[PDB]
Amino acid sequence: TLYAPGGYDIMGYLIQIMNRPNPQVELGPVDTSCALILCDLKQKDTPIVYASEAFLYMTGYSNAEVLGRNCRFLQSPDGMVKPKSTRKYVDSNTINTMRKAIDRNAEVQVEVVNFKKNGQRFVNFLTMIPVRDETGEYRYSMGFQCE
Ligand SMILES: Cc1cc2nc3c(=O)[nH]c(=O)nc-3n(C[C@H](O)[C@H](O)[C@H](O)COP(=O)(O)O)c2cc1C
Secondary structure (H helix, E strand, O other): OOOOOOOOOHHHHHHHHHOOOOOOOOOOOOOOOOEEEEEEOOOOOOOEEEEOHHHHHHHOOOHHHHOOOOHHHHHOOOOOOOOOOOOOOOOHHHHHHHHHHHHOOOOEEEEEEEEOOOOOEEEEEEEEEEEEOOOOOEEEEEEEEEO
16 A cells, blocks of 8 residues: 555545535544544555554554554454455444445445454444545545544
């Protein structure tokens, strides 16, 4: 996975999200002190390109451990999850709901069982919102995690 030199406009994307004209989900106000990640929709398998400190701390993973991976690794206490695999700890419909939303650039909000690096189970109230870059096309997805 490639990462933008000098980083991502996380604050600008938060503002874009808070200002979005027809919010389909209730997110409320958010900021950089929240558990959030940004994933790149135009790299293979939608890799994490940015993780906030609060995400790293909620999950127990380091920046080196998370960047460049699809976030589905959180769905197993091993951190090992193949795409299209049936999940042991998440129901199929929730997984499919997330995938379809992301593919359609549709906002979605789910509750999913996730696991910290130490294997501790937690319930993740997850909101994903697509984000337009400077071209005006949907390029990223910003995910907001709550425990
Ligand atoms: C911005 C963003 C944040 C995500 N955060 C999480 C998360 O915290 N936990 C999780 O279980 N899945 C998360 N996902 C969902 C998975 O990465 C993946 O999209 C989901 O498993 C459905 O796709 P799949 O069928 O390829 O696995 C996130 C996805 C995106 C794009």
